[PDB]
Structure 1
Amino acid sequence: ISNKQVILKDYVTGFPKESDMQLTTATTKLKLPEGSKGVLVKNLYLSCDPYMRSRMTKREPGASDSFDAGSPIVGYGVAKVLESGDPKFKKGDLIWGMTGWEEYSVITSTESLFKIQHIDVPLSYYTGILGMPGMTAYAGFYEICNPKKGETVFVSAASGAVGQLVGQFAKLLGCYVVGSAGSKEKVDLLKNKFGFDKAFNYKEEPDLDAALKRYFPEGIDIYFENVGGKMLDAVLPNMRVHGRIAVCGLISQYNIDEPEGCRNLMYLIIKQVRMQGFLVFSYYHLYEKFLEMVLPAIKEGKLTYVEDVVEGLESAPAALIGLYAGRNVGKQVVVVSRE
C-alpha cells in the first residue's frame, strides 16, 4: 500500500519554509511490528498547532522534544485503528492523539490516545475544540485565571482554537472580553461569530497601549497570553490590581524580527499580578469533565468553533507554513482521508 508522508528534511534555523519538508511516497503492508504494544492507524485529520513551530529547531530535552530529521512530522490527529497490540484498542476504533504526517502510522504506545465515542460531531473537532486546544483553553481559563463574573479579560491570538474557546468561556461566565488578531476578517469573526465584546487588529495599531485603553479604560483583570513580545509589554501597564496573566504560549518569540525581552515586569509589583505558566499535559485528568461541559454546549450552539480546512497531505506543508506566518483563519486542519 502507498504511504505518502511529510518528511522533515532539515533541522530549521531561520523562519520555517515549505522546502524544509519533503513530500514522499513510502510503502506499507499494514502490519503491526511483531511484539508491538501500539496501534497501526489510518490517519484521517491532522492539526497544525502553533506549538509545532518550536519543534522545527534541534534541541536536547530543554523545551516542553524537537522533530527527527528524515522522519515524518508528528502532531495531533484523528485516526482509525487498523491493528492493535494493546487489547484495550480494537480494529475500527476512532482515536485522537499524537500521530505521523502520513497516510498510515504506527503509534508505538497507546497511553496518550483517546477513543472517540461521540461521533455526532465532526471528527475534525477532536483536533481543536474537543482536542488538545480545547482542553488547553479549559485548563488555562478555569484552573489558572481564577475568573469571576464582571472581570475584564484580554486574549491574544484570540482567533486561534485556544483563544476562541477562552473568549467564549469568559463570555459565558459574564466577563467583558476583548481579543487581538492580525486582520479585519479575524477581528470581525471574534465579534460576530464568537461573541467577544470587542477586538482589534494589532498589525494596524500604532500604539498598543492606546488600543488597550480604548477597550479597557479601567484595565485588565485577566490576560490569556498566547503570543508574548510587544503585546505582553503593552498589557503589563494595563493590568488591574491582583490581575492574572495565564502564560499559555509565547509564539512571537520564535520570530527573529519580534522584539526580544519583556521590559515591563515592574508592573507585576505595582499591580500585584500573578503571571503563571502552565502545560495542558498536567490537566488531562479533567478531560472527561471538560467533555461533559463542552459537548452539550456545542450541540446546543452555546459554544461554536472555526476551523481552516486544507484538503490532502500534499497541502499540509503550505498550511503549516501559513499558520506560522499568521495567514490562516481559525484552527488549521488537514483532511488526509475522510474514512
Structure 2
Amino acid sequence: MIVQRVVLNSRPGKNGNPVAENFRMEEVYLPDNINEGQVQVRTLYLSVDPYMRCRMNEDTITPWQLSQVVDGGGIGIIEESKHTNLTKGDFVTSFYWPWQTKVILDGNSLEKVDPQLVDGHLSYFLGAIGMPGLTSLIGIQEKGHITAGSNKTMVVSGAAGACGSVAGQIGHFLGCSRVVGICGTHEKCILLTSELGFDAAINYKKDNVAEQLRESCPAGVDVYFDNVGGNISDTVISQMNENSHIILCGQISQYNKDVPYPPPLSPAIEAIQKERNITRERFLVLNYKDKFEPGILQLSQWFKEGKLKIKETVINGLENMGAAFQSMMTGGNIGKQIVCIS
C-alpha cells in the first residue's frame, strides 16, 4: 500500500515566520507487516498547535528533523492490532501521531478514547474535550483563584482560539461575573459575544485596547488568562487589581523571536506587577496529568449540557498541514485548528 506523509522541508530560522513551504508532502509504501504489540491505524484528524513552532527550530523535547516525518496530536481508528487492549475498530489518540495517512504504531504509545464523551465528534478530543480544553480548565482551577460568586472580572487574550474560547466560557461557569476577550478580528469579537457568552470582545488590531478595557472592565481585572504576551499583556497588566492573578498559558506573540520563555515583563510592567502583588507563575498542563480524567469528564459534561460551546476550523487533507499550521499561527482559525485526514 502507498500512503501520504508530511516531512519537514526547511526551517524558518529562530527569528523567522513559519510558512507552508517549511513542509513537504511525499508518498511512501506502508509496511505490509506489523510486529507484536504494534497496531496499524487509519489517521482521522491531526492537530496543529503553537508549541510546534519551537520544534521547527534547531534548538528546543526534540525538534523536528529535516526530511523526517512530522508528528503531533492525532486521532485515528485501529485497522489491525497485535496489542492486547486494542482491537480493529477502536478509536485511539496519541501526542505523537505521525503526519501520515495510515501508520504502524506500538500500541503502548496509544490511548483509547470514548466517542460517547464527544457525541461522536472525534475532532473535539484534539480541542475543547482534549489538551487545549484541559489546559484552560486546569489553568483556571489551579492558578485562577476564582470562587463561585466572586463578581470577578477575567480578561482572556487569544480569546477566539482553542484555549482562549474555552477559558472564557469556563470563567463564567466558575464564578466570574465579567469575561472580556481580546482577539485579532471583528469577526472573532462578534462570535465571542454573540455565541460564547463573552461580555465584551476587543480587536487588538483596530480598537484602542486600553480605552476599551477601561469601558468593559470598570472595576479592573482580577484574572488574566494569557495566551499571547507582549504588548497586549502589558496593556492588560496595567489595568489589573491588587492581588490579581495571571494564568500564564502561552506567549504566542514571542514564538517567532529568539527570546527566553517565559518572556520577562518590561521594567515598567514588572514594577506594576510586583507593586500590585500580581502572581504570574509558569503553567504547564502536563504537570497535572492526574486531573486529566476529571477535567475531561467535566468538559464533556458541560458540552453535553449545552453550556460549553465548541468552535473549530477544519481544513481537509494531509497536503494542507503546512497551510493549516501557517494559518493558525497567523489567526486564520476560529476556535481549534483541525486537519481532517479521512
TM-score (ref. length: structure 1): 0.91
CA distance in 2, matches of 1:306, 1:153: 20
Contact 2:6–2:70 under 8 Å retained in 1:
yes
Quickly say closer, same or farther: Cα 1:297–1:187, change in 2 above 3 A: same
Deviation at 1:120, TM superposition (A): 2.5
Of 81-90 and 154-163, more deviation after overlay is shown by 81-90
CA positional deviation for 1:9: 1.4
**Aligned positions, number:** 330
Helix, strand or coil: the match of 1:203? coil
1:30–1:50: structure 2 CA closer, same or farther, 3 Å change rule? farther
Cα gap change, 1:73 to 1:213, in 2 (>3 Å): same
* In structure 1, C-alpha distance between the alignment counterparts of 2:2 and 2:146, rounded to whole Å: 50
Matches of 1:84 and 1:68 in 2, distance apart?
29
The C-alpha deviation readout for 1:182-220, integer Å capped at 9, x for no partner, is 1111001110110001111000134x3223222222211
Structure 2 counterpart SS, 1:303: coil
Superposed CA offset, 1:70-102 (max 9, x none)? 122211111112334532222221012220111
Tell me, yes or no, if the aligned pair for 1:157 and 1:180 is still in contact at 8 Å. yes
The CA deviation string for residues 162-183 of structure 1, in whole angstroms up to 9 with x for no partner, is: 1111111111223110001111
Determine if contact 2:92/2:110 at 8 Å carries over to the other structure: no
User: Where does residue 103 of structure 2 map in the other structure?
Assistant: 105
Distance in 1 of aligned mates of 2:50 and 2:38: 27
4+ residue stretches of structure 1 with deviation over 3 A?
83-86, 106-109, 255-258
Shift of 1:17: 1.5
Aligned match of 2:184: 182
Give the aligned partner of residue 309 of structure 2: 304
Give the Å deviation of 1:48. 1.6
Q: Partner amino acid for 1:116?
A: D
- The amino acid that maps onto 1:239 is M
Q: Which residue of 1 aligns with 2:169?
A: 168
**Alignment of structure 1 residues 238-317 onto 2, 5 Å:** 238-256=239-257, 262-263=265-266, 264-317=269-322
Inter-partner Cα distance in structure 2 for 1:325 and 1:31: 41
Shift of 1:306: 0.7
Alpha carbons 1:137, 1:163 under 8 Å: kept = yes
CA distance in 2, matches of 1:173, 1:238: 22
Summarize deviations over 1:300-327 as a string: whole Å, max 9, x none.
2111111101111122221111111112
* Paired position in structure 2 for 1:137: 136
Amino acid at match of 1:128: G
Change (3 A) 1:66 1:78: same
| Aligned-residue identity in percent | 33
Q: Where do 1:114-263 residues align within 5 Å?
A: 114-118=112-116, 120-148=119-147, 149=149, 150-175=151-176, 176-206=178-208, 208-256=209-257, 262-263=265-266
Contact 1:3/1:104 (8 A) holds in 2: yes
- What secondary structure does 2:51 align onto? helix
Relative to the length of structure 2, the TM-score reads 0.90
